[PDB]
Design a protein around this ligand. Structure first.
Ligand SMILES: [Zn+2]
Lengths: 108, 149, 279, 166
RNA sequence: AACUGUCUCUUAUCUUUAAUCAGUGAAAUUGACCUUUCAGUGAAGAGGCUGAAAUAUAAUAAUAAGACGAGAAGACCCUAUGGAGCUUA
RNA sequence: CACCAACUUCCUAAACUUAAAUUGGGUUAAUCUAUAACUUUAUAGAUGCAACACUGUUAGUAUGAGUAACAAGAAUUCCAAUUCUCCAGGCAUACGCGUAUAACAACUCGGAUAACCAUUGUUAGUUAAUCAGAAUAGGCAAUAAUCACACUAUAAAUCACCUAUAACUUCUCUGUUAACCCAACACCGGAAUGCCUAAAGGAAAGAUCCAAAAAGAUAAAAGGAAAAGAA
RNA sequence: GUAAGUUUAGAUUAUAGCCAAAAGAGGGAGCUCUUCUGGAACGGAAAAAACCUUUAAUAGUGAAUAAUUAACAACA
């Protein structure tokens, strides 16, 4: 079955310009205090998350080199230490990861 | 028609879902923080919490050893669960896993993204939300009400 | 490419027509535009009016102060119409007042002033002059001619006409061309009357007549959103005037307006003014 | 092809006289060649019409459509030139006066099928037009109240003239 | 004969489709259409005529019984003091 | 005890009497030439001189319709990175193709989307004495193979070496890449031989939802046409 | 009452209706024919090629008229 006649632009225009078919505005936009960038109320910041995710790779890269092989996951707890920080007695008996950078302000 | 459903349909079948969940659980244990789709992350959150209980049960438990071996493909992790994860969560009675929403992937599919991590980990803290301080005008007004009461 | 020169020329005219509609040219006075002869137009202007004008005086009346400045400014890089202007305006005021008084002796002097002011208003004078082509014949440094300058020339021409043709011809000219504009003009349209009830009482006491007692003769749709109220003013229990209104206050106000017209003999059915008289 | 939108940015007004209000700035920006459907892009344009510069940008940042990202890029370029070349003091003082999309030159190809059939393949391109006016978006319209409607209806009745009568 | 959801008598689960987001993007078709119901009229015949009736604008989602639905050079048999072609003993 | 209603008729101004093949007569759009005119005109002479309609021809742009339609195993420390989950015709030659090979740089076009390139541009490539391709005249021949022996059979199944003549010291040329071919297409199709069957070769999941309806698959209380047995 | 007609010469085109209404013949309903008559609204009969009122067609914010779906139980 094919259309019996051409559909008029006016009829077509009304269909596409009906409110149901139009793009709706969003009121859930929020600001990120940490980075000062926009975010949604139910969505986290990304500018700061970029630092966190990349820092994780840098920390993970250090971990990968230290292990040196697959299936080498330690059976003991692990800790990350940055330059200017010295291991404590409580840190004994735990895998220690050394980071050349200083302790990040956000990281505690 | 998803009324009363308590299980998500993932993978190519129920076995694939277990294997896909098994792979996700193994990866999470190794790294302690993994980013995945929100639907899949929610489904696997319950499994991770129960796994910590199995570690708490004890190494000598035959069921735990069988459970740990099946769920963890990489066998180096089996000592870790009983000697790293289980000792860490001994004080905790639950809520071992923290799941939060991440901005959706800009990969042309706009999948809902979430991050699931084990609490008490050595990884850098996630950017968690901070509640409003009591110094705010509304809270201070409520503080005055509290003092009167 | 379509060949031929006639077709290409035809399209050029088509482009010009579109260009004219899109971008109308700025207005310019006919004096600047070609094929204009001031002397011929003045002679034709006088002949068309069937009136005798002193060419020298008429030119002075058309001459304006602003026009002289432009010539002087051009000269740096002539008689004003003020004297003639005063005569026409002053004479017109007396003559215009004379017309009103004769038809409506009862009408107060204050009312005649309002009528005279309206008939001598800048808009009224400007409308007559522009429709008479006087603007083209007006001498000024700005186009369109400013209304106050245009008004000055109109009365200035009247002063020149008085010298050329005497008051009698000018009076007929005023009656034929200016008094005609009052046709279809209601009294309160040309005269602003506030507080008609008080004014009506003021006239009645002067005539030693009792103030009317207002009564509601007829009413319809009182409680509806479209109410009609008829209020009649009863003097000594006798109806003197009745007016229609939407509210009692409006009906009373309208009824008072009708009485004022009757008091001054401005009834709608009153005898029309005469332009027939050749004398 | 016609590029009159750019020429609108080359218009130079006469020097403003002392007795004239400060002329509001008008900026026209367009992208002539976009590998996007004009019809789909129009949906984005229609919604953003009349909104502020900041509000439109904020919505675009959280939009899923590819066209929305293009619109934001177009908006940013227009804003940059406005301050750089149109002497705009406050960046925030901008609103979307006009937003529309137009058709662009396309490419034609044949669409093969596995069963010997063929189809008409087209690579769609479009143009996008936006005009930005310095200042906040105009206040929204207030719908007429019942009292206003009744007054006009009475006024309309009075305005009526008698038809076909002496 | 057995066997079984063929059926008495249907139900449940999974995959595909489906629905939503994003990217890309055809074909048959098309006089114009501001594209209703009943009865009449007519050639078996009316969204557009006659007479009644109904009727905010615009949308959105579903099903295929009938209009003895619309269709082709489809099917069958027979005729010709029809043609034409062919063969002759 | 009437009115209304037709250009029938009267009235003011005019007019001077009722369909369509065909036939008689009067004009006209456009272009060129002759001769004039000079913001596009005149008189003559000429002609590829006038399109709302041939399922006309060519081009453009709509409608159907943003509809049919199409798509990548997981995690991470990263796309010639690791590890995990699962699949099971792979490697050589022939033939064909002819630079699709490889590196770099691009992000427009091509892949029916991205990532990435198979795209665009530039530069590079495939190595052979061993792998592959590129003198003459006479004389004389009974008896297959089949582990060839026995043993049979029927479809009836192998130059050499002698006798003379002639020449008299040699390693160049060409082929060599590839994920590749025949089917209009990066087409669920077609495509010889040898070895071997996973050590080789691979990925069904663009995201979300779990609509109805429909298709495929699995399961069935009691019964068995409302198992593999006979004719 | 009215204005065409006859002859001579040249020359083609048309030569198929439709419906209504009369007169016949087949026939017995109705049909099937032959013959005569009339018709082609912009008005009317409901819409109505074929019936009725209507001589052409001009402008006017005049007038008189035509046809014109309506009609008003019985016993001496
Ligand atoms: Zn931040």
């Amino acid at each position: 079955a094919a259309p019996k006649n051409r559909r008029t632009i006016e009829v077509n225009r009304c269909r596409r310009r009906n409110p149901q078919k139009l793009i709706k505005i969003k009121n859930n936009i929020d600001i990120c205090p940490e980075c000062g960038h926009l975010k949604q109320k139910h969505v986290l910041c990304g500018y700061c998350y970029e630092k966190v995710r990349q820092e994780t790779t840098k920390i993970r890269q250090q971990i990968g080199a230290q292990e040196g092989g697959p299936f080498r996951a330690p059976s003991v707890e692990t800790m990350v230490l940055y330059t200017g920080e010295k291991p404590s007695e409580k840190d004994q008996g735990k895998r220690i990861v050394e980071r050349n950078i200083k302790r990040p302000s956000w990281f505690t | 028609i998803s009324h009363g459903r308590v299980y998500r349909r993932l993978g190519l079948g129920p076995e694939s879902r277990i294997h896909l969940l098994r792979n996700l659980l193994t990866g999470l244990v190794r790294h302690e923080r993994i980013e995945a789709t929100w639907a899949r992350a929610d489904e696997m959150r319950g499994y991770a919490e129960k796994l910590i209980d199995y570690g708490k049960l004890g190494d000598t438990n035959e069921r735990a050893m069988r459970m740990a071996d099946f769920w963890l493909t990489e066998k180096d992790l089996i000592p870790k669960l009983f000697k790293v994860l289980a000792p860490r969560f001994q004080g905790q009675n639950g809520n071992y896993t923290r799941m939060l929403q991440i901005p959706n992937r800009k990969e042309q599919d706009r999948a809902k993204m979430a991050v699931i991590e084990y609490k008490g980990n050595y990884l850098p803290p996630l950017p968690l939300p901070h509640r409003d301080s009591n110094l705010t005008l509304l809270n201070q007004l409520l503080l005055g009400l509290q003092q009167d009461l | 490419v379509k060949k031929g020169f006639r077709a290409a020329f035809r399209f050029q005219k088509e482009l010009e027509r579109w260009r004219l509609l899109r971008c109308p040219p700025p207005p310019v006075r006919r004096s600047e535009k070609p094929n204009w002869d001031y002397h011929a137009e003045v002679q034709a202007f006088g002949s068309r009016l069937q009136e005798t004008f002193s060419l020298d005086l008429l030119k002075t009346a058309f001459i304006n102060s602003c026009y002289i400045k432009s010539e002087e400014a051009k000269r740096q890089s002539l008689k004003d119409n003020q004297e003639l202007f005063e005569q026409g305006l002053s004479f017109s005021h007396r003559c215009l007042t004379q017309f009103l008084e004769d038809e409506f002796p009862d009408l107060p002097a204050e009312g005649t002033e309002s009528l005279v002011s309206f008939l001598t208003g800048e808009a009224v004078v400007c409308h007559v002059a522009r429709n008479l082509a006087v603007e083209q014949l007006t001498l000024s440094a700005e186009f369109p001619v400013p209304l106050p300058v245009l008004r000055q020339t109109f009365f200035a021409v009247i002063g020149a006409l008085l010298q050329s043709s005497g008051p009698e011809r000018a009076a007929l000219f005023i009656r034929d061309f200016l008094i005609t504009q009052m046709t279809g003009k209601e009294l309160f349209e040309m005269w602003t009357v506030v507080n008609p009830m008080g004014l009506l009482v003021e006239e009645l006491k002067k005539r030693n007549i009792s103030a009317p007692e207002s009564r509601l003769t007829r009413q319809s749709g009182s409680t509806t959103a479209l109410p009609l109220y008829f209020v009649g003013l009863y003097c000594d229990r006798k109806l003197i005037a009745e007016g229609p209104g939407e509210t009692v206050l409006v009906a009373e106000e309208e009824a008072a307006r009708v009485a004022l017209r009757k008091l001054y003999g401005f009834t709608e059915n009153r005898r029309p003014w005469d332009y027939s008289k050749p004398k | 092809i016609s590029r009159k939108w750019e020429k609108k940015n080359k218009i130079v007004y006469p020097p403003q006289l002392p007795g004239e209000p400060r002329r509001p700035a008008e900026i026209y920006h367009c992208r002539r060649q976009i590998k996007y459907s004009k019809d789909k892009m129009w949906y984005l344009a229609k919604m953003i019409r009349g909104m502020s510069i900041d509000q439109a940008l904020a919505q675009l940042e959280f939009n899923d459509k590819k066209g929305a990202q293009i619109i934001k890029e177009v908006l940013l370029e227009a804003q940059d030139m406005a301050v750089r070349d149109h002497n705009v003091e406050f960046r925030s003082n901008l609103h979307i006066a006009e937003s529309t999309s137009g058709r662009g030159q396309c490419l034609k190809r044949i669409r093969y099928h596995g069963r010997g059939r063929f189809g008409i393949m087209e690579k769609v391109y479009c143009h996008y037009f936006v005009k930005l006016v310095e200042g906040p978006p105009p206040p929204p319209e207030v719908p007429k109240t019942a009292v206003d409607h009744a007054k006009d209806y009475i006024q309309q009745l009075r305005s009526r003239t008698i038809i076909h009568t002496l």
